[PDB]
């Protein structure tokens, strides 16, 4: 059984649904191919995402990263999306210290009050790690039916998959969990009086699961080890990041700005080596010249403090100031 209710907000529970917060659980209830179309933006307040890869209310999105690139801080920022009512975070297969750090020092007090956090660490049984995602999805669905815009954050599908495989290896004693992964992903999305927008993390570089998850979702955000080592945070690789609902949830003004931005990064990347070895010559190529002049402002725009939440009005204004 899964505990559901508005009173779970601000609580931390496990794969079965037992409190981990040093207190007893409150009084709460126990519980296809396409969904409704995605038509409304869900602003994250993260400028790199909202500018060129705008998410949709009810979208499912994969976050692809290597270890130690600031994925946790990105997830904490996603918890502060101005367009969401509440959050369901599910943390599967990480070590105790890492998870403890995350909840106590990375998530603020204000953010935690708006989350239900479901935790199944690596030291827990494979069955618990797998059950954690079923529980989180059911809790998110209950909020959706109460007419909330829910954000579901799942870290990670990779460790979920590892736990599911462990269960398959023990299926002999004594055996729809084995086919569950695509059905869980399809349980999120738009609904009558509500929505679930979902971010699922995938570890690289494991490799086939990433391919399976790409075929199932509506966009991908790619984190880059290179950016992270430069101290460029969130370490989002813009040119490798895509949102399938981008053309439908944005304005024309927005789309034009985003195109200038991508063009600049693409032009810059092609000439990056020439610059690094000091062989670039101005006047040569005007477009690239403009890209290079524009590049430092774009980098500043993309790098974002974990405490800064940027709404859409300000977003558009900053893009104009640097690109136009």
UniProtKB/Swiss-Prot annotation:
**Family note:** Belongs to the ATPase alpha/beta chains family. T3SS ATPase subfamily.
Q: Which reaction does it catalyse?
A: ATP + H2O + cellular proteinSide 1 = ADP + phosphate + cellular proteinSide 2
Sorted alphabetically, the Gene Ontology cellular component annotations on this record are: cytoplasm; host cell cytoplasm; host cell membrane; type III protein secretion system complex
Location (main, coarse) = cytoplasm
Q: Does the keyword Nucleotide-binding apply?
A: yes
- Entry keywords, A to Z: ATP-binding, Cytoplasm, Nucleotide-binding, Protein transport, Translocase, Transport, Virulence
Q: Which residues are ATP-binding? A: 68-73
Its EC number is: 7.4.2.8
GO BP: any one term? proton motive force-driven ATP synthesis
State any single GO MF term. Answer: ATP binding
Describe what happens without this gene.
Deletion mutant cannot secrete the effector proteins SseB, SseC, SseD, SseF, SseG and SseJ. Mutant is also defective for the secretion of the translocon proteins SseC/SctE and SseD/SctB. Mutant shows decreased virulence in the mouse model of systemic infection.
Protein name in the entry: SPI-2 type 3 secretion system ATPase
Mutation: residue 95 to G; reported impact is:
Lack of ATPase activity. Cannot dissociate SseB/SsaE complex
Function statement: ATPase component of the type III secretion system (T3SS), also called injectisome, which is used to inject bacterial effector proteins into eukaryotic host cells. Acts as a molecular motor to provide the energy that is required for the export of proteins. Required for type III secretion apparatus (T3SA) formation, secretion of a subset of SPI-2 effectors and virulence. May play a critical role in T3SS substrate recognition, disassembly of the effector/chaperone complex and unfolding of the effector in an ATP-dependent manner prior to secretion.
Q: Where in the cell is it found?
A: Cytoplasm
Q: Does the keyword Cytoplasm apply?
A: yes
Subunit (UniProt): The core secretion machinery of the T3SS is composed of approximately 20 different proteins, including cytoplasmic components, a base, an export apparatus and a needle. This subunit is part of the cytosolic complex. Forms homohexamers. Forms a complex with SsaK/SctL (stator protein) and SsaQ/SctQ (the major sorting platform component). Interacts with the T3SS-2 specific chaperones SsaE, SseA, SscA, SscB, and SrcA.
This protein's species is Salmonella typhimurium (strain LT2 / SGSC1412 / ATCC 700720)
Q: Which domain of life is it from?
A: Bacteria
